[PDB]
Amino acid sequence: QVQLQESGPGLVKPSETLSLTCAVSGVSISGNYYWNWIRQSPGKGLEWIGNIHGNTAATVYNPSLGSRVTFSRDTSKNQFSLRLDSVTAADTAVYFCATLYEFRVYMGERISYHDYWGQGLLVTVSA
Amino acid sequence: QVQLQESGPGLVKPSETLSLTCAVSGVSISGNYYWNWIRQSPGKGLEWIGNIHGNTAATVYNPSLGSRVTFSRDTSKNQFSLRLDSVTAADTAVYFCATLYEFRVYMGERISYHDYWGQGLLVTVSA
Amino acid sequence: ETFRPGGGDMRDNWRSELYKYKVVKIEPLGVAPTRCKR
Amino acid sequence: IRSENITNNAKNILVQFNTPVQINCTRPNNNTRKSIRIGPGQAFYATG
Amino acid sequence: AENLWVTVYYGVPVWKDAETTLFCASDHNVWATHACVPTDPNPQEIHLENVTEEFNMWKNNMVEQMHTDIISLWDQSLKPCVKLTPLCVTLQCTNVTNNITDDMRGELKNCSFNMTTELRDKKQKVYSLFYRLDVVQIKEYRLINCNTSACTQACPKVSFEPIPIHYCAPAGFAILKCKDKKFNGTGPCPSVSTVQCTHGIKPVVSTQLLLNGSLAEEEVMIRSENITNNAKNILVQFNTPVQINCTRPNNNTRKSIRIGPGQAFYATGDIIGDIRQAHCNVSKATWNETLGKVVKQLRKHFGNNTIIRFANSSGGDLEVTTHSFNCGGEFFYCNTSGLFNSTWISNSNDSITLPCRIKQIINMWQRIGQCMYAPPIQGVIRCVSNITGLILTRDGGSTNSTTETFRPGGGDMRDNWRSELYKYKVVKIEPLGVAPTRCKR
Amino acid sequence: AVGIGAVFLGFLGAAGSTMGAASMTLTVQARNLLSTVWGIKQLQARVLAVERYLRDQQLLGIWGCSGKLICCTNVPWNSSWSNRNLSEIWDNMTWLQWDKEISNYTQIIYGLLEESQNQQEKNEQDLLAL
Amino acid sequence: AVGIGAVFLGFLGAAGSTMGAASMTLTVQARNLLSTVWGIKQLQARVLAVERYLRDQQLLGIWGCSGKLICCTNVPWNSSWSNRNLSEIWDNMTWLQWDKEISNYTQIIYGLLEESQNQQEKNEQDLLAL
Ligand SMILES: *[C@@H]1O[C@H](CO)[C@@H](O[C@@H]2O[C@H](CO)[C@@H](O[C@@H]3O[C@H](CO)[C@@H](O)[C@H](O[C@H]4O[C@H](CO)[C@@H](O)[C@H](O)[C@@H]4O[C@H]4O[C@H](CO)[C@@H](O)[C@H](O)[C@@H]4O)[C@@H]3O)[C@H](O)[C@H]2NC(C)=O)[C@H](O)[C@H]1NC(C)=O
Ligand SMILES: *[C@@H]1O[C@H](CO)[C@@H](O[C@@H]2O[C@H](CO)[C@@H](O[C@@H]3O[C@H](CO)[C@@H](O)[C@H](O)[C@@H]3O)[C@H](O)[C@H]2NC(C)=O)[C@H](O)[C@H]1NC(C)=O
Ligand SMILES: *[C@@H]1O[C@H](CO)[C@@H](O[C@@H]2O[C@H](CO)[C@@H](O[C@@H]3O[C@H](CO)[C@@H](O)[C@H](O)[C@@H]3O)[C@H](O)[C@H]2NC(C)=O)[C@H](O)[C@H]1NC(C)=O
Ligand SMILES: *[C@@H]1O[C@H](CO)[C@@H](O[C@@H]2O[C@H](CO)[C@@H](O)[C@H](O)[C@H]2NC(C)=O)[C@H](O)[C@H]1NC(C)=O
Ligand SMILES: *[C@@H]1O[C@H](CO)[C@@H](O[C@@H]2O[C@H](CO)[C@@H](O)[C@H](O)[C@H]2NC(C)=O)[C@H](O)[C@H]1NC(C)=O
Ligand SMILES: *[C@@H]1O[C@H](CO)[C@@H](O[C@@H]2O[C@H](CO)[C@@H](O)[C@H](O)[C@H]2NC(C)=O)[C@H](O)[C@H]1NC(C)=O
Ligand SMILES: *[C@@H]1O[C@H](CO)[C@@H](O[C@@H]2O[C@H](CO)[C@@H](O)[C@H](O)[C@H]2NC(C)=O)[C@H](O)[C@H]1NC(C)=O
Ligand SMILES: *[C@@H]1O[C@H](CO)[C@@H](O[C@@H]2O[C@H](CO)[C@@H](O)[C@H](O)[C@H]2NC(C)=O)[C@H](O)[C@H]1NC(C)=O
Ligand SMILES: *[C@@H]1O[C@H](CO)[C@@H](O[C@@H]2O[C@H](CO)[C@@H](O)[C@H](O)[C@H]2NC(C)=O)[C@H](O)[C@H]1NC(C)=O
Ligand SMILES: *[C@@H]1O[C@H](CO)[C@@H](O[C@@H]2O[C@H](CO)[C@@H](O)[C@H](O)[C@H]2NC(C)=O)[C@H](O)[C@H]1NC(C)=O
Ligand SMILES: *[C@@H]1O[C@H](CO)[C@@H](O[C@@H]2O[C@H](CO)[C@@H](O)[C@H](O)[C@H]2NC(C)=O)[C@H](O)[C@H]1NC(C)=O
Ligand SMILES: *[C@@H]1O[C@H](CO)[C@@H](O[C@@H]2O[C@H](CO)[C@@H](O)[C@H](O)[C@H]2NC(C)=O)[C@H](O)[C@H]1NC(C)=O
Ligand SMILES: *[C@@H]1O[C@H](CO)[C@@H](O[C@@H]2O[C@H](CO)[C@@H](O)[C@H](O)[C@H]2NC(C)=O)[C@H](O)[C@H]1NC(C)=O
Ligand SMILES: *[C@@H]1O[C@H](CO)[C@@H](O)[C@H](O)[C@H]1NC(C)=O
Ligand SMILES: *[C@@H]1O[C@H](CO)[C@@H](O)[C@H](O)[C@H]1NC(C)=O
Ligand SMILES: *[C@@H]1O[C@H](CO)[C@@H](O)[C@H](O)[C@H]1NC(C)=O
Ligand SMILES: *[C@@H]1O[C@H](CO)[C@@H](O)[C@H](O)[C@H]1NC(C)=O
Ligand SMILES: *[C@@H]1O[C@H](CO)[C@@H](O)[C@H](O)[C@H]1NC(C)=O
Ligand SMILES: *[C@@H]1O[C@H](CO)[C@@H](O)[C@H](O)[C@H]1NC(C)=O
CA E94, distance to chain mean position in Å, is 36
Flag whether C touches G (3+ CB pairs, 8 A cutoff): yes
| Cβ(D24) – ligand 5 distance below 6 Å | yes
CA atoms within 13 A on the CB side of E32: 14
**Number of Cβ pairs < 8 A linking chain C and chain G:** 7
- Radius of gyration of chain G from its Cα atoms, rounded to whole angstroms: 20
Is C16 an 8 Å CB contact of chain D? yes
The minimum CA-CA distance between C32 and chain D, rounded to whole Å, is: 40
Mutate to test the pocket of ligand 18, among E252, E271, E272 (most ligand atoms within 8 A of CB): E272
CA E393 – CA E409 distance, rounded (Å): 6
CA nearest neighbour of F70 among F22, F114, F104, F14: F22
Residues of G in contact with E194 (CB under 8 A): 10-12
Q: What stretches of chain F adopt beta strand conformation (E)?
A: 5-7
CA A34 – CA G107 distance, rounded (Å): 17
Resolution in angstrom units: 3.2
| Cβ(E355) – ligand 19 distance below 6 Å | no
Interface of G with C (CB under 8 A): 125, 128-129
Q: What residue of D is the nearest CA neighbor of E151?
A: D40
| Cβ(E200) – ligand 8 distance below 6 Å | no
CA nearest neighbour of F86 among F30, F23, F26: F23
CB B100 within 8 A of CB B48: no
CB E167 within 8 A of CB E197: yes
CA B112 – CA F15 distance, rounded (Å): 50
Write out the H or E segment, with its range, that includes residue B72.
Answer: strand B69-74
> Pairing between strand E403-408 and E307-310?
parallel
Mutate to test the interface with E, among G48, G55, G91, G99 (most CBs of E within 10 A): G99
Strand pairing partners for C8?
A: none
CB E154 within 8 A of CB E374: yes
| N residues, chain E | 441
E109 Cβ contact list (under 8 Å, min separation 6): E93, E94, E95, E96, E129, E130, E131, E132, E135, E141
CA F3 – CA E168 distance, rounded (Å): 52
Q: What residue of F is the nearest CA neighbor of C37?
A: F74
CA A104 – CA A113 distance, rounded (Å): 9
Mutate to test the interface with G, among A56, A73, A75, A106 (most CBs of G within 10 A): A56
- State whether E2 and G69 contact (CB < 8 Å): no
Write out the H or E segment, with its range, that includes residue G109.
Answer: helix G107-128
CB E425 within 8 A of CB E57: no
CA nearest neighbour of E88 among E361, E378, E359, E333: E361
Residues of G in contact with E437 (CB under 8 A): 72
CB A34 within 8 A of CB A101: yes
The minimum CA-CA distance between C24 and chain D, rounded to whole Å, is: 22
Flag whether D touches F (3+ CB pairs, 8 A cutoff): no
Flag whether B touches F (3+ CB pairs, 8 A cutoff): yes
> What type of residue is E318?
L
Q: Which long-range contacts (CB under 8 A, 24 or more apart) does B69-72 make?
A: B71/B35, B71/B37
Supply the DSSP string of G37-86, one letter for each residue: HHHHHHHHHHHHHHHHHHHHHHHHHHTT-TT-SEEEEEEE--TTT----G
> Pairing between strand B18-25 and A45-53?
unpaired
- State whether F104 and B56 contact (CB < 8 Å): yes
Longest dimension (CA), chain C: 73
- Experimentally determined by: cryo-EM
CA E53 – CA E187 distance, rounded (Å): 8
CA nearest neighbour of A9 among A95, A98, A97, A102: A95
- Phi, psi at G67, each rounded to 5°: 70, 25
- State whether F50 and G54 contact (CB < 8 Å): yes
Helix axes G37-62, F37-62, angle to 10 degrees: 30
CA E1 – CA E124 distance, rounded (Å): 101
Which ligand 1 atom sits nearest the alpha carbon of residue E28?
A: 30
| Cβ(E211) – ligand 1 distance below 6 Å | yes
- State whether D40 and E369 contact (CB < 8 Å): no
Mutate to test the pocket of ligand 7, among E89, E109, E111, E114 (most ligand atoms within 8 A of CB): E114
The minimum CA-CA distance between A65 and chain G, rounded to whole Å, is: 25
Residue E269 CA: distances (Å) to CA of E139, E155, E158: 21, 18, 22
CA D40 – CA D21 distance, rounded (Å): 49
CA E290 – CA E288 distance, rounded (Å): 5
Strand pairing partners for E351?
A: E283
Looking at residue E141, the DSSP 8-state letter turns out to be E
> What type of residue is G45?
A
CA of G18 to the centre of ligand 3 (A): 10
Q: What residue of F is the nearest CA neighbor of G43?
A: F43
Q: For residue E240, give the ligand nearest its CA.
A: 8
Is D38 an 8 Å CB contact of chain E? no
Please tell me the residue having the least CA distance from ligand 15 atom 11.
E95
Q: What is the tally of helices (H) and strands (E) in chain D?
A: 0, 2
Which ligand 19 atom sits nearest the alpha carbon of residue E338?
A: 14
Residues of C in contact with G129 (CB under 8 A): 35-36
Strand pairing partners for E110?
A: E94, E129
CB E16 within 8 A of CB E428: yes
CA E251 – CA E271 distance, rounded (Å): 6
CA nearest neighbour of E236 among E430, E39, E418, E52: E418
CA of F92 to the centre of ligand 2 (A): 10
E213 Cβ contact list (under 8 Å, min separation 6): E204, E237, E386, E388, E389, E419, E420
Strand pairing partners for E309?
A: E343, E405
CB E99 within 8 A of CB E275: yes
E370 Cβ contact list (under 8 Å, min separation 6): E149, E151, E152, E363
Residues of A in contact with F9 (CB under 8 A): 105-106
CA G27 – CA G9 distance, rounded (Å): 12
Residue D16 has its nearest CB partner, among C3, C6, C16, at C16
Which ligand 5 atom sits nearest the alpha carbon of residue D25?
A: 27
Mutate to test the interface with D, among E144, E149, E373 (most CBs of D within 10 A): E149
Supply the DSSP string of F25-49, one letter for each residue: -HHHHHGGGT--HHHHHHHHHHHHH
Mutate to test the pocket of ligand 17, among E53, E182, E186 (most ligand atoms within 8 A of CB): E186
Residue G128 CA: distances (Å) to CA of E286, F73, F119, G61: 88, 11, 21, 22
Q: What residue of C is the nearest CA neighbor of D14?
A: C16
- State whether D40 and E146 contact (CB < 8 Å): yes
Domain ranges in chain G are 12-128
CA E186 – CA E56 distance, rounded (Å): 4
CA nearest neighbour of E15 among E173, E197, E194, E169: E173
Buried b (16+ CB within 10 A) or exposed e, F84-109: eeeeebbeebbbeebeeebeebeeeb
Q: For residue F22, give the ligand nearest its CA.
A: 2
| N residues, chain A | 127
CA of E30 to the centre of ligand 16 (A): 30
Looking at residue E155, the DSSP 8-state letter turns out to be P
F109 Cβ contact list (under 8 Å, min separation 6): C31, F75, F81
The minimum CA-CA distance between B56 and chain F, rounded to whole Å, is: 7
Buried b (16+ CB within 10 A) or exposed e, G85-104: eeeebbeebbbbebbeebee
Is F21 an 8 Å CB contact of chain G? no
